[PDB]
Amino acid sequence: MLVLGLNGNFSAADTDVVPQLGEVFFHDSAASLIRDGELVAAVEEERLNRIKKTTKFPLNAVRECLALAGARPEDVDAVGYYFPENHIDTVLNHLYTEYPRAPLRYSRELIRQRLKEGLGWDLPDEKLVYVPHHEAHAYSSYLHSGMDSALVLVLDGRGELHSGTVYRAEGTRLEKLADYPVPKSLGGLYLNATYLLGYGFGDEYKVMGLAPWGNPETYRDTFAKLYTLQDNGEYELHGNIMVPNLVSPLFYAEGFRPRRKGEPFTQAHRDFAAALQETVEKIVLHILEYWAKTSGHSRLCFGGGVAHNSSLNGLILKSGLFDEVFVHPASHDAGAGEGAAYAAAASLGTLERPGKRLLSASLGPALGGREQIRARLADWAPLIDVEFPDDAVETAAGLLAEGQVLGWAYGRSEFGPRALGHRSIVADARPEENRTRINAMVKKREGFRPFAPVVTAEAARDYFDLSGADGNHEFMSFVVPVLPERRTELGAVTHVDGTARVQVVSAESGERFHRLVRRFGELTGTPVLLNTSFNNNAEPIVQSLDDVVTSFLTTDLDVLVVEDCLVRGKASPDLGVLVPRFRPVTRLVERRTAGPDASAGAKTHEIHLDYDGGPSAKVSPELYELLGAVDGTTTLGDLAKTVGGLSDALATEVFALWEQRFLTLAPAGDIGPLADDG
Amino acid sequence: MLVLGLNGNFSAADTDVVPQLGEVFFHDSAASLIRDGELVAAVEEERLNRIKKTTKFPLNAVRECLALAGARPEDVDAVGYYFPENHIDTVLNHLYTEYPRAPLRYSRELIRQRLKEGLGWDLPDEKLVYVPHHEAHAYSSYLHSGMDSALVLVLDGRGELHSGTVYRAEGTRLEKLADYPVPKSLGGLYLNATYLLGYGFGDEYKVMGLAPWGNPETYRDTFAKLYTLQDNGEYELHGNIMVPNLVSPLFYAEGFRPRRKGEPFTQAHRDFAAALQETVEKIVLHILEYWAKTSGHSRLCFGGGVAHNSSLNGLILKSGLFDEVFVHPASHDAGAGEGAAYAAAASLGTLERPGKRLLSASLGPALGGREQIRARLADWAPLIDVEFPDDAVETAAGLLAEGQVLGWAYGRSEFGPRALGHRSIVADARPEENRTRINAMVKKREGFRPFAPVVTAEAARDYFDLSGADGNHEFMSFVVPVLPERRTELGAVTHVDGTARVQVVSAESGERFHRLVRRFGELTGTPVLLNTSFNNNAEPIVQSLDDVVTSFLTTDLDVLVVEDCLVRGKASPDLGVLVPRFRPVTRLVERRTAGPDASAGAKTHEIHLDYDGGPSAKVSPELYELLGAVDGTTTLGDLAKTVGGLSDALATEVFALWEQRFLTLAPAGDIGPL
Numbered sequence A: 001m002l003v004l005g006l007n008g009n010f011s012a013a014d015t016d017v018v019p020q021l022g023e024v025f026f027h028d029s030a031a032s033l034i035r036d037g038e039l040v041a042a043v044e045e046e047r048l049n050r051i052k053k054t055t056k057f058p059l060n061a062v063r064e065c066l067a068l069a070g071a072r073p074e075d076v077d078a079v080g081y082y083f084p085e086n087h088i089d090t091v092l093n094h095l096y097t098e099y100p101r102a103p104l105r106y107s108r109e110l111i112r113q114r115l116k117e118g119l120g121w122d123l124p125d126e127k128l129v130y131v132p133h134h135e136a137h138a139y140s141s142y143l144h145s146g147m148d149s150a151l152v153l154v155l156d157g158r159g160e161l162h163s164g165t166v167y168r169a170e171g172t173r174l175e176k177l178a179d180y181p182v183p184k185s186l187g188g189l190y191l192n193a194t195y196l197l198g199y200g201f202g203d204e205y206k207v208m209g210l211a212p213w214g215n216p217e218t219y220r221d222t223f224a225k226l227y228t229l230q231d232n233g234e235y236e237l238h239g240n241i242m243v244p245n246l247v248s249p250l251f252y253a254e255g256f257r258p259r260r261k262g263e264p265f266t267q268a269h270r271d272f273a274a275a276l277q278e279t280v281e282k283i284v285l286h287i288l289e290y291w292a293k294t295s296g297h298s299r300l301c302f303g304g305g306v307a308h309n310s311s312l313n314g315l316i317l318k319s320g321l322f323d324e325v326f327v328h329p330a331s332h333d334a335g336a337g338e339g340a341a342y343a344a345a346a347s348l349g350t351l352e353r354p355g356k357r358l359l360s361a362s363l364g365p366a367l368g369g370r371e372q373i374r375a376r377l378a379d380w381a382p383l384i385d386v387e388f389p390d391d392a393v394e395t396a397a398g399l400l401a402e403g404q405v406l407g408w409a410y411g412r413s414e415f416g417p418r419a420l421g422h423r424s425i426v427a428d429a430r431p432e433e434n435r436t437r438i439n440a441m442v443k444k445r446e447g448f449r450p451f452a453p454v455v456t457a458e459a460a461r462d463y464f465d466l467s468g469a470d471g472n473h474e475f476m477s478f479v480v481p482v483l484p485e486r487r488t489e490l491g492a493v494t495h496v497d498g499t500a501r502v503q504v505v506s507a508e509s510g511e512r513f514h515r516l517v518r519r520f521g522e523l524t525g526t527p528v529l530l531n532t533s534f535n536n537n538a539e540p541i542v543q544s545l546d547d548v549v550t551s552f553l554t555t556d557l558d559v560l561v562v563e564d565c566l567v568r569g570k571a572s573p574d575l576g577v578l579v580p581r582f583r584p585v586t587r588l589v590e591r592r593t594a595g596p597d598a599s600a601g602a603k604t605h606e607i608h609l610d611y612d613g614g615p616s617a618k619v620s621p622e623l624y625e626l627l628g629a630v631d632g633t634t635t636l637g638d639l640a641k642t643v644g645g646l647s648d649a650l651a652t653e654v655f656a657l658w659e660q661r662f663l664t665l666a667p668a669g670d671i672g673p674l675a676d677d678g
Numbered sequence B: 001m002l003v004l005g006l007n008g009n010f011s012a013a014d015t016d017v018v019p020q021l022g023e024v025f026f027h028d029s030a031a032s033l034i035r036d037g038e039l040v041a042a043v044e045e046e047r048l049n050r051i052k053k054t055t056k057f058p059l060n061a062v063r064e065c066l067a068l069a070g071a072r073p074e075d076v077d078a079v080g081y082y083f084p085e086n087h088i089d090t091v092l093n094h095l096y097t098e099y100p101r102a103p104l105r106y107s108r109e110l111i112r113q114r115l116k117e118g119l120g121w122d123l124p125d126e127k128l129v130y131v132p133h134h135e136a137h138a139y140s141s142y143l144h145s146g147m148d149s150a151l152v153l154v155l156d157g158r159g160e161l162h163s164g165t166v167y168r169a170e171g172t173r174l175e176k177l178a179d180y181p182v183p184k185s186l187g188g189l190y191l192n193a194t195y196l197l198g199y200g201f202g203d204e205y206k207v208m209g210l211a212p213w214g215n216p217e218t219y220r221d222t223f224a225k226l227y228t229l230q231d232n233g234e235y236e237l238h239g240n241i242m243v244p245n246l247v248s249p250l251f252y253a254e255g256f257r258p259r260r261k262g263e264p265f266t267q268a269h270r271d272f273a274a275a276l277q278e279t280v281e282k283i284v285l286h287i288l289e290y291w292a293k294t295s296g297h298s299r300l301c302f303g304g305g306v307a308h309n310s311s312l313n314g315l316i317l318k319s320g321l322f323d324e325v326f327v328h329p330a331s332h333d334a335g336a337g338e339g340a341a342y343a344a345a346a347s348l349g350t351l352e353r354p355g356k357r358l359l360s361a362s363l364g365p366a367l368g369g370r371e372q373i374r375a376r377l378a379d380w381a382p383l384i385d386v387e388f389p390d391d392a393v394e395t396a397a398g399l400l401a402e403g404q405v406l407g408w409a410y411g412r413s414e415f416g417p418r419a420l421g422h423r424s425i426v427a428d429a430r431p432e433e434n435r436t437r438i439n440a441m442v443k444k445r446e447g448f449r450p451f452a453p454v455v456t457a458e459a460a461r462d463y464f465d466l467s468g469a470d471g472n473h474e475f476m477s478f479v480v481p482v483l484p485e486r487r488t489e490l491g492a493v494t495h496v497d498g499t500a501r502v503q504v505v506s507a508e509s510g511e512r513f514h515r516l517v518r519r520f521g522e523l524t525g526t527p528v529l530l531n532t533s534f535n536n537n538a539e540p541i542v543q544s545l546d547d548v549v550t551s552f553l554t555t556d557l558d559v560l561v562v563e564d565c566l567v568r569g570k571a572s573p574d575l576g577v578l579v580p581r582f583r584p585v586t587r588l589v590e591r592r593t594a595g596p597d598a599s600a601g602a603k604t605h606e607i608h609l610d611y612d613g614g615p616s617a618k619v620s621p622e623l624y625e626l627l628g629a630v631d632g633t634t635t636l637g638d639l640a641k642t643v644g645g646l647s648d649a650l651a652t653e654v655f656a657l658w659e660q661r662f663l664t665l666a667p668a669g670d671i672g673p674l
C-alpha cells in the first residue's frame, strides 16, 4: 500500500497556469510518500525549484520521493490531493474567467498531464482521491503524535468551507466536533495585519518575532473593535465593505499608516505587532478553553498554518488545559498534502497509521554518497579548500568553541520550515553579539529577531522551563521561557521577554546533531547551540550539495561541515570555471520606456525571475551581452571572452547576481544521480 | 460661479499610483465645468490619452474644459470629487499596504499635486468638496432632465456604501428614500456574468447586444438560484464563499464552461446572456414597480452605470410605470463627476440649475477652426486627397445613397459612450449586408453585434414604436421596437428581436446631423441612417483632427467628411513622411527566457502599452532597432535609413502597429491651439 500525497497548484517550471498567478493560490507545493502507514519521504517543491513557498506543480518533489522509496510511478496505489475537486476546480474556473486566453484544464486533467509528461506515469482516474482540506491537516497532525486519542484543532487561512475545525481523534477514526466559517479566519486576520507592517505572505513569523519588542496595550482597544468573544467557544470577526482586509480601514481611520520598504520599525509598529499577537492568542485560547471542557480530553494535536505560531503554542503549553500537546514539523499546507495521502488510503480500503511519534523531520533527499560528494567537491576545487578530519563532529565542536560560525549539512533535508540539524547554520549560543553578527553580516537579514537554541535532551530542563504540559520540542514548535538564571548565559538565543523557540535534540531525533551539541557542552559547560536555517535572504533552505556550496560561498560563514568534509573558501576563488545556467523562471530583458517629447526613452538592461513577487536587478550592457550568450555548457570565463574577459568589475557584478540567485552558477556537470546506501 | 467636476484615480500619464493598477480602480476619468448651473464643457480623459475607460487622472480634460469655457484655473470657485474622502483614501491605503514602496499620498494631496504641476494651480483646501457617490449621480441625472420633481433611481456597481440609491427630487432638493447595500449590486452581477462570456470590464453592452439571440428559458431556473424577489420592493442576491464572482461557481457546477477569447459564441453562450439580461430586468422592474407606487412620482430619472443598459431602459419605458423617463448621456462615472460639481456648488452656497432638458451631448473639444483645419489637412497631403464641396451635407447624403460608408466628424465631441453625429460613422440603414460588412470589415467585431439607427424627429413615429412613457431619445438611451411593417426596410439597424437602440435627432439636438438625415430621406425615401461610433476596436472615440484622419486611414471607410472637407486615401500613401512618437505608455522590450538545457532562449522583440489590460505585439529585429531611434521629430522615412530604408515589409509592419495604436504616427507638427 504505497500512497502519494500532493498539494499546490499546477503550473509548470517555466510558466504559471495563468500569467503572474498570485503567490497565495495554493502555495507550499510538496509531495509525500507513505508505505503501509509510514511516512517514507516528503520534500517541499520549494527546496528543488528554489522558489520560497512556490505554488508550482511539485513534479520534482514527486520524482525525489519515488526514488527515495525505490518505486516506479506505476508502483503507486493511490494519489491524494489536499482539497475537494469541486473546490480547486471552481477556483481554477475563476482564474480562467479572468484570463480568457487560458485553456480550460481543471485539476484532474492538469494533475494527470503533469505526471504523464514529467514522469511517463499514466494515472488511472480511480487512483486520484480528493480530500477535505482540514481533514488532510488533521490526519497529518494526529497520526504522527503517537497518541491513541486526542482533541484535534485545525486553524489556517481557509479550507474549502472553513477556517477552523475541531476533531475528536481515536485510533484511526476522525470525528468532527465543530467548525468556524471562512470570514472568521485567524490566518486571514494575521496575514491582513502583516501587510500593514510592510510585509507580505510568508512574513508572519517575522511579525511574531517582532511582537515581544512591543507593548500590547497601545492598540488593545483598537483590535477590540475587530473581534468579540462569544459563548460556547464562538467568536466573531467584524468585517467591512471597504477593502478586502479586516484590519486596515479602522487603523487608517485612527492615523496608523502602514510601513514602507526600508523604513525602520517604529514604536507604533512594534506595538501593533504585539497587540496583533495578543489578539490571536486571546481568541485561540478561548476556542480551546471550551473544547477542552466540552470534550473532556487531555491531549491536543494542533495543526494548520496558524500552528506555526511558536508563541501561541507555548501559551497553550502553559495554559493548563492539556497534559500533552503535539505539533507536526510541517503544519502548513505541505503537511495537508501528507494527510491527503492517509485520507486517500482510508477512502480506498483500510488506513494504516505510523508506529510511534515522529521525532525526525529528516525526510527529504540526501546530499549523496561520500564517493559522489568527494568527487563533486573536487569539481568545486577552483573555489574551495577541503579537509577530511578524522572526527568531523569532534573538529566542528572545537571550531564552535573557538567562535566560528558553521554551515552544517548532513543526510536528508528537513520537511517543514525549521532547520533541525541537517541543513543548519550553527554557532555558540552564549555571545549576545552573535545575533547581529549572524543576522546581518553572514546571512543578511533583520536583527530584531533572536535565534533559536538547540539543547540536549539531558540538559534541556537545566536551561528551559519545559513545564506546563508535555509538548514535543523536536521541531521548535513551542516557545518556552528561558530559566532566569541562565538568561545572561544564553545571549544569542534569548528574546527580550526571556523566551526561546527551543529545539530539544536526543539520540533518537538526531544522533549526529546530538553528539555535536553534547561535545560542545563538554568543551564549554553550555550544551546549547544557536540553530538557524542554512539559506540567505534570497532562497529557501538549501537542498543539493551544489546548493550547500553555493550558499556557503555567497554568505560570510567561516567553515562548512558537509558529510564530514570541512570546506573553506579559497584565497581568491576562480568564478570563471562556474558554468552559468538559466533557471526556468529567468528572464533577460532590454527595455525602452517613453521619453521626453514622446521619444524612445531610457535604455535599461535587467535580469528578473518571472513569478509573482520575484526579484529583479539592473545589469550593465556588458553583462547583458554576456548573459544572453549563456548556452548552459560554456563556462563564465569562456563566455566573458566575447566581451573582453572576466574583469574584476564583471566578476563582482556576476557575484552580486549569484547572491540574489537570478541564475544557477556551479561547476560543469552535476553530482550525478543520488546514491543508494541502505 | 464656475465649478469643476472631477472623477477618476490620480495616476500620471506614464505610471500608475501603484504598478499595474487594475482597470476598475476608479475608471472613466473625466472633467466637467458648470457655470451658473449650465454644463458648459465635459470630456472623458479616455478621449485625450486614448486609453479606453482610463483610470488616470483627468489632467488633460481639466485643461480642455477651462479652454472651452474661456477660463483660467484661478477662475474656478470649487472642485467636486465624485466619492467621499474617507472612502477613496481607505482604498488608496489598501493599495499601499499591498505595495510597500508606494509613498503614502492620499487623494487630497494627489489632487493638489496634479493640478499644481499640471496647470500651475494652487487649489486651496477649502475649495475641494468631496461628495457621496450616488448623490453625484442623482444630481447629474436629475438636473438635466428638465423636470422639477421626479423619482431618481441610481444603480451602479457601488458607491461608498450602497449598490443602489432611490431619491425624491423636488426643485433642487434631493431626499433619499431608500438604498440597497453593496452585496446586492446589479452592476456587480452583470460584470460577474460578463466574465463568463470571455469579456471583461467595459464589455457589458456587448453582452446586452448578445442577449436577444438567446433563449432566456434555458438558464432561467439557474439564475433563479442567485436572487430572490421579496415583498415591498426588496430583493436578495445569494453569494458564496468560493470565489469573488457571484455567477460562475453555480454555473460551473451545472456544466457551463467560460468562453475563451477567439472562440465562437455558442447557443449556450447566447442563452446565458438572455437569462442574465432577463434577471436584471426582473429585479430593476421589481424595484421600480414598488417605488413608483410608494413615492407617487409619475416621472423617473435613471442614472448610474446600469442606466446604460439600453434594453432595460426600453423595458422601463414600456412597463407603463411612469409617464416620463429621462436618462443622461453619461450615466456612468463621468456623469457622477459632473454631478459632483452641482453637489459642491450646493455645499458652498446655493445651487443654480440648468434651465432646459439636455438635448445635445456635444460638450468636448472641437476639431479646430476653418483655416487651422485646412492647414493641418495639408500636412497630411502625402496620404490623403481632399475636396471642398459647395454643400458637404448635400454631397455626403448622395454618397450615403450610393452605398458609401462615411466617417463624420464635426464640432465638439460626444460626452458619454454614444456617438450622436459629431464623431460618427454612418451608412445606409436599409441593406442588411451593411450590418454584416461594417461589423466584419470596418469596426472589426462580432457578427452578432447590432447597429443603432438615427432618425429625424419628424419621421421617428413612422418607423419606431415610441409608445408608452415619453422618454428622451437624443442620446440612444432606449431600445425600442421597430414597427413590424418597417423591419424589412431597415435591414441593417433592426436587431434580431425587431428592436433598435434609436437616436431621434432634431434641429435643436443636432442641426447639421438632422439636415444630413433629412436630406438622405428626401433622396431615398428613408430618413434613417446607421450610426456607429467613429473608432476602431483599438481606441476610444476619435477626438482630434489627427485622431479622425488616423482612424480614417486605418479602418476601411470609403470617405471622411470632416468640417465640410471631403477626405479620401491616396492610391499610394507615403507613410515615410509621418513622424513616429511614443505614447507615454509605450514600451519596447527585447526578451530572453530559458531555453533547452538551461540556456538563454532566443531573442524576441515586443512593443507593449504599460497599463492593466494593455495590448502587446511581436516586432521584427529591424523594426525593433528603428523604434529605438525614435526622437519625436524625425520622420519614419529618415528613421528607416539606419536599418536600410523604409522597405515595403517595414511600412506594412509599422502600418499594423499604427492600427493597434502602439505609437502615434502623424505628420510633423500639430494643429495648434483651437
Ligand SMILES: COc1cc2cc(c1Cl)NC(=O)C[C@H](O)/C(C)=C/[C@H](C)[C@@H](O)CC(=O)[C@H](OC)/C=C/C=C(\C)C2
Binding pocket: A024, A025, A026, A027, A091, A094, A156, A157, A158, A159, A160, A187, A188, A191, A201, A333, B241, B242, B243, B244
Ligand atoms: C482573486 O481570487 C481570490 C481571492 C481571494 C480568495 C479566493 C479567490 Cl478565488 N478564494 C479562495 O478560495 C482561495 C483558495 O482557497 C486558496 C488560494 C487557498 C490557499 C491554499 C489558502 O492558503 C488560502 C489562504 O489562506 C490565503 O492566504 C494565504 C488567503 C487568501 C485570500 C485571497 C487570495 C482572497
Ligand SMILES: COc1cc2cc(c1Cl)NC(=O)C[C@H](O)/C(C)=C/[C@H](C)[C@@H](O)CC(=O)[C@H](OC)/C=C/C=C(\C)C2
Binding pocket: A241, A242, A243, A244, B024, B025, B026, B027, B091, B094, B156, B157, B158, B159, B187, B191, B201, B333
Ligand atoms: C482588491 O481590491 C478591491 C477589490 C474589489 C473592491 C474593492 C477593493 Cl479595495 N473595494 C472598493 O471599495 C472598490 C472601489 O470603491 C472602486 C474600485 C469603485 C469603482 C470606482 C466603482 O466603479 C466600483 C465598480 O463598479 C467595480 O466594477 C467595475 C467594482 C468592482 C469590484 C471589485 C474591484 C472588488
Ligand SMILES: Nc1ncnc2c1ncn2[C@@H]1O[C@H](COP(=O)(O)O)[C@@H](O)[C@H]1O
Binding pocket: A028, A155, A156, A157, A158, A186, A187, A188, A190, A191, A204, A205, A208, A304, A305, A306, A308, A309, A310, A331, A332, A333, A334
Ligand atoms: N506565525 C503565524 N501566525 C499566524 N498565522 C500564520 C502564521 N504563519 C502562517 N499563518 C497563516 O497560515 C495560513 C496558511 O496556512 P496553510 O493554508 O495551513 O499553509 C495563512 O493564512 C497564514 O497567514
Ligand SMILES: Nc1ncnc2c1ncn2[C@@H]1O[C@H](COP(=O)(O)O)[C@@H](O)[C@H]1O
Binding pocket: B028, B155, B156, B157, B158, B186, B187, B188, B190, B191, B204, B205, B208, B304, B305, B306, B308, B309, B310, B331, B332, B333, B334
Ligand atoms: N449595459 C449594462 N448593463 C448592466 N450593468 C452595466 C452596463 N454597463 C455598465 N454596467 C455596470 O455599471 C457599473 C459601473 O457603473 P459606474 O460605477 O456608474 O460607472 C459596473 O458594475 C458595470 O458592470
Ligand SMILES: [Fe+3]
Binding pocket: A133, A137, A156, A157, A158, A304, A305, A332, A333, A336
Ligand atoms: Fe491549510
Ligand SMILES: [Fe+3]
Binding pocket: B133, B137, B156, B157, B158, B159, B304, B305, B332, B333, B336
Ligand atoms: Fe457609479
